[PDB]
Write a protein that binds this ligand. Structure first.
Ligand SMILES: OC[C@H]1O[C@@H](O)[C@H](O)[C@@H](O)[C@H]1O
Lengths: 158, 158
């Protein structure tokens, strides 16, 4: 029942006018792909969905040198929980180059992550709640995405 | 439940691998916005949703000369039906510049059309059914959108 657009500058965060909850959708749009960027720290790029208290509902980290895409969560001031892994980063973006899109479906019990058309994981949540903020973290030097990524939300669907 | 990406060239149509039904979403992305493109004939740009028999479930037309946006439907062979229109094109796009996106929510009994974050209309259907294909008609010379439009679909939502 509603669309929202956010330009997220590399290394910043954004508060949602409308929170993302069960049945809602969020897609991050990048106008570039640099699968040949520098060494991650260890992350080249990360995309996150936060809850009101600041907890990491979903942590999406892209690492070229480690050639893996990690997923995890963690309480506001606690340790990282059980992380999930998907090897071969460049392979998840196959089919499209020059740009890319990362979608996260809030399925209530899980976070379905899809890169372009390919579902990368059915991430069972380790932490529950509603998403009230998003972030795109990376340096201008080593990000695999454009300096500014556009987050599009589709809320009020259920 | 997933995502599908289609690169549509002005004047062509495309068949959906995943049909769009009640509870589903389609968004056309344009990488430009020329509001000085010239006069339509009478249309500058049109975006359409088709049933399997060719009928126009939803027809959206942008006309700069008439400074109005049109919505309608019609059977493969029948005549256009009751035209629904909204004035001031530029106003609908106010907010973002070198680009634009148009979203359509299939609400079963209505198609909600949102430009960027602005709902332009809650279109009561004149014809119902699932969307089997899409199209984007315009010429290079007067289209208000980029020469190639990217439609993205989110299906299996309901
Ligand atoms: O009612 C919608 C129709 O309006 C006509 O005037 C136009 O020639 C058609 O292309 C279609 O847009």
């Amino acid at each position: 029942q509603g669309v929202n657009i956010y330009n997220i500058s590399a290394g910043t965060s954004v508060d949602l006018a409308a929170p993302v909850t069960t049945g809602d959708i969020v897609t991050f749009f990048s106008s570039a792909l640099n699968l040949n960027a520098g060494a991650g720290n260890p992350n080249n790029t990360t995309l996150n969905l936060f809850a009101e208290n600041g907890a990491y509902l979903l942590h999406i980290a892209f690492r070229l040198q480690e050639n893996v895409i990690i997923f995890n969560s963690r309480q506001p001031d606690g340790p990282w929980l059980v992380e999930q892994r998907v090897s071969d980063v460049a392979n998840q973006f196959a089919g499209i180059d020059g740009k890319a899109m990362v979608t996260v479906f809030d399925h209530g019990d899980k976070y379905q992550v899809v890169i372009n058309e390919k579902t990368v994981i059915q991430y069972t949540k380790q932490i529950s709640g509603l998403t009230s903020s998003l972030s795109y973290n990376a340096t201008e030097e080593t990000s695999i995405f454009s300096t500014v990524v556009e987050a599009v939300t589709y809320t009020g669907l259920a």
